[PDB]
């Protein structure tokens, strides 16, 4: 019955501003505490902040890596939770979540703040922080067995990598892209090779980038 719907994520430049919204239904939103939790790509969860209800004087707590830059507010008339991201940095990239937080205190064994547990979560919205204008990839060959092509500095996604115009499909693996500190995605694809015959058969990777309309073919040869 409980539902949480996040919205407002997208591309943002460093130092810019963005606002995230989380609508709630299925529970008493007026007296429930809310918390934002973010997860960087490939990393763990991080507590962002929590805003209380009117019983606790609308008080908001923030994480130390978040204070002074993000602001959390709520609108009980619309059952929405907000997260105003200001002076955004490249480190803030990741999926942002809103969760209906519970409050627990064991009476016989207990402590002053009261252990807080996040009961119901949302699906999350993605916020990519890059300064970078659309840019075609640069492909550098990787010499041998294993053969690879380094797609580097491409924005935005995606890049489709094909080997020998679709003939090469044995052992091929196209890794996941990584968003660099520069703000430009980079990616590699590797093919396992018979390790006996290399001179007889050519090995060319076909890199395709539709946002920039750039098609690149690079011959990979041994040193």
């Amino acid at each position: 019955e409980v539902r949480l719907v996040e919205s407002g994520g997208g591309l943002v430049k460093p130092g810019g501003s963005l606002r995230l919204s989380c609508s709630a239904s299925g529970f008493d939103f007026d007296n429930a505490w809310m918390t934002w939790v973010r997860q960087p790509p490939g990393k763990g969860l991080e507590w962002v902040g929590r805003i209380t209800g009117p019983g606790e004087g609308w008080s908001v707590d923030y994480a130390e890596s978040v204070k002074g830059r993000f602001t959390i507010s709520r609108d009980n008339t619309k059952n929405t939770l907000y997260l105003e991201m200001n002076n955004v940095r490249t480190e803030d990239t990741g999926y942002y979540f809103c969760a209906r937080t519970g409050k627990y205190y064991d009476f016989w064994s207990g402590y002053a703040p009261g252990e807080e547990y996040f009961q119901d979560w949302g699906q999350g919205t993605l916020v990519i922080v890059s300064s970078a204008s659309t840019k075609g990839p640069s492909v550098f060959p990787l010499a041998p067995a294993a053969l690879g092509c380094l797609v580097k500095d491409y924005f935005p996604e995606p890049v489709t990598v094909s080997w020998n115009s679709g003939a090469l499909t044995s052992g091929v693996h196209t890794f996941p892209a990584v968003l660099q500190s520069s703000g430009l995605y980079s990616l590699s694809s590797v093919v396992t090779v018979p390790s006996s015959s290399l001179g007889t058969q050519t090995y060319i990777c076909n890199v395709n980038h539709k946002p920039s309309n750039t098609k690149v073919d690079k011959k990979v040869e041994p040193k």
């Binding site: 969860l45 991080e46 969760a99 550098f140 060959p141 693996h173 990584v178």
Partner: protein, 210 residues
Amino acid sequence: SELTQDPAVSVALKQTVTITCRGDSLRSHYASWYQKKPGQAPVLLFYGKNNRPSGIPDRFSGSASGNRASLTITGAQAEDEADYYCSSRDKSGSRLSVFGGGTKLTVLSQPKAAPSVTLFPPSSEELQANKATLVCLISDFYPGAVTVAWKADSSPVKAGVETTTPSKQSNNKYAASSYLSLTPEQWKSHRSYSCQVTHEGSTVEKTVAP
């Protein structure tokens, strides 16, 4: 990291596994546990002293003693393979909340395999373009949990390291890639560059030189 967990723990099918979360604040507070599958929303599993929310199977159970919090899965199944996080206060009495490092639980479905590591030096074409990038490709390992560290000669490298999350290949094994961005001057200078790949308590190292 106020709350610390093991990075990855493997469990056999229909067996019992315990994930341990440790921290100073756990001496004065309980801990809540969460199950996170890739893409799907995190789900609360256990909280408080002996509280299990309705819907969660009874094979999950929690415990705590001293500065440790333990989540026990009795008779693990295939669908239990996911990331598990602990959550409590960062300090005793603090109004803030913090999460643990995370424990990648893997259910044994394929015979465990050691990684194959390949390290590529920067191409002469890239060095001509005032750029340099080291590519350390890892594949054919199980379970999909490795830790990659870069070495400049005998000194670890922290700046410019980008390593992707492991992904399954077409042969039921995982593969991960790592990158290291240097300047052409930092490349031609160094005697050797090393990519240390640690998997299941054992490390495989490959080295390249200009």
